[PDB]
Amino acid sequence: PVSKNIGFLFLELRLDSKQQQIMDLVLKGVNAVMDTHHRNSFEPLHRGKFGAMKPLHVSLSETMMFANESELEEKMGRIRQEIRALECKSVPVALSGGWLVYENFDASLQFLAVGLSEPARGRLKPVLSIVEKYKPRSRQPVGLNNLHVSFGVAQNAYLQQDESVSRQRLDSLRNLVATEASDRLPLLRANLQFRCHELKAKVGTSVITLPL
């Protein structure tokens, strides 16, 4: 369908029981601040209905829109082969710094995130380099400067207002979570760490695994 000839690369982060409980209390605390300030709350991304588990992610490419099935296979195969040829056998994922808020492509959703640590970004640099080499030439770039894990997602209440009003409320939301909702970030950063032994790629409607 719409996803024909679309590819995207990412890391999958499955949380253990302790990490799930930490994210419950961190997000509850953030959302108490959102309530106090009459802001939209963040839906936790690590849980579904009835506490069904959902993995978290690190995006490693933009949405890659290839011109045809042949180019999809040519470029994704080269990506897979070159990632396999890397020396590394696993990459660490750990977080550094404060809350970030990233918008999706139509600004309808605002994701509460933390950036990757300097060593985590450094170990992913050779992966990003491979993606940059093979991705289609064909507006939300993924790069070393913005690698992150998103933990919650809120609706943009200002989606249909003037762009400048929506951007102002986004910047004051970013300031609000940083100034008033950051006290449990040391607990999050100490515990939300992972080691990934494979990448994933969405290709069309299928997901493939790319071993390290």
Author numbering: 61 to 198, 202 to 275
Question: What's the paper's own text on this?
Answer:
The responsible exoribonuclease is Usb1, which removes nucleotides from the 3′ end of U6 and, in humans, leaves a 2′,3′ cyclic phosphate that is recognized by the Lsm2–8 complex. Usb1 is a member of the 2H phosphodiesterase superfamily of enzymes, which contain two vicinal active site HxS/T motifs that are essential for catalysis. We examine the structure and function of Usb1 from Kluyveromyces marxianus, which shares 25 and 19% sequence identity to the S. cerevisiae and Homo sapiens orthologs of Usb1, respectively. We find that the origin of CPDase activity is related to a loop structure that is conserved in yeast and forms a distinct penultimate (n – 1) nucleotide binding site.
Subsequent trials were performed with N-terminally truncated Usb1 by removing the first 58 amino acids (residues 59–275) that was designed to mimic the crystallizable S. cerevisiae and human orthologs of Usb1 (5,11,14). The structure of KmUsb1 was determined by single isomorphous replacement with anomalous scattering (SIRAS) methods and a uranyl acetate heavy atom derivative. The asymmetric unit contains three subunits, each of which is essentially identical in structure with an average alpha carbon pairwise r.m.s.d. of 0.63 Å for residues 61–275. Consistent with previously determined Usb1 structures, KmUsb1 retains the canonical 2H fold, with two conserved HxS motifs buried in the central cleft between the transit and terminal lobes in a very narrow channel that is just wide enough to accommodate single stranded, but not double stranded RNA. In addition, two glycerol molecules are bound in the catalytic pocket as high-occupancy ligands (calculated values are between 0.87 and 1.0), where one of the expected catalysts (His211) forms a hydrogen bond to a hydroxyl group of a glycerol molecule. The active site of KmUsb1 is similar to ScUsb1 as both have a 310-helix loop architecture in the n nucleotide binding pocket (residues 207–209 in KmUsb1) which is absent in HsUsb1. In contrast, this loop is much larger in both KmUsb1 and ScUsb1, with an overall positive charge and includes a 310-helix structure. The overall K. marxianus, S. cerevisiae and human Usb1 structures are highly homologous, although KmUsb1 more closely resembles ScUsb1 (the r.m.s.d. values are 3.1 Å for 182 aligned alpha carbon residues between KmUsb1 versus ScUsb1, and 4.1 Å for 159 aligned alpha carbon residues between KmUsb1 versus HsUsb1).
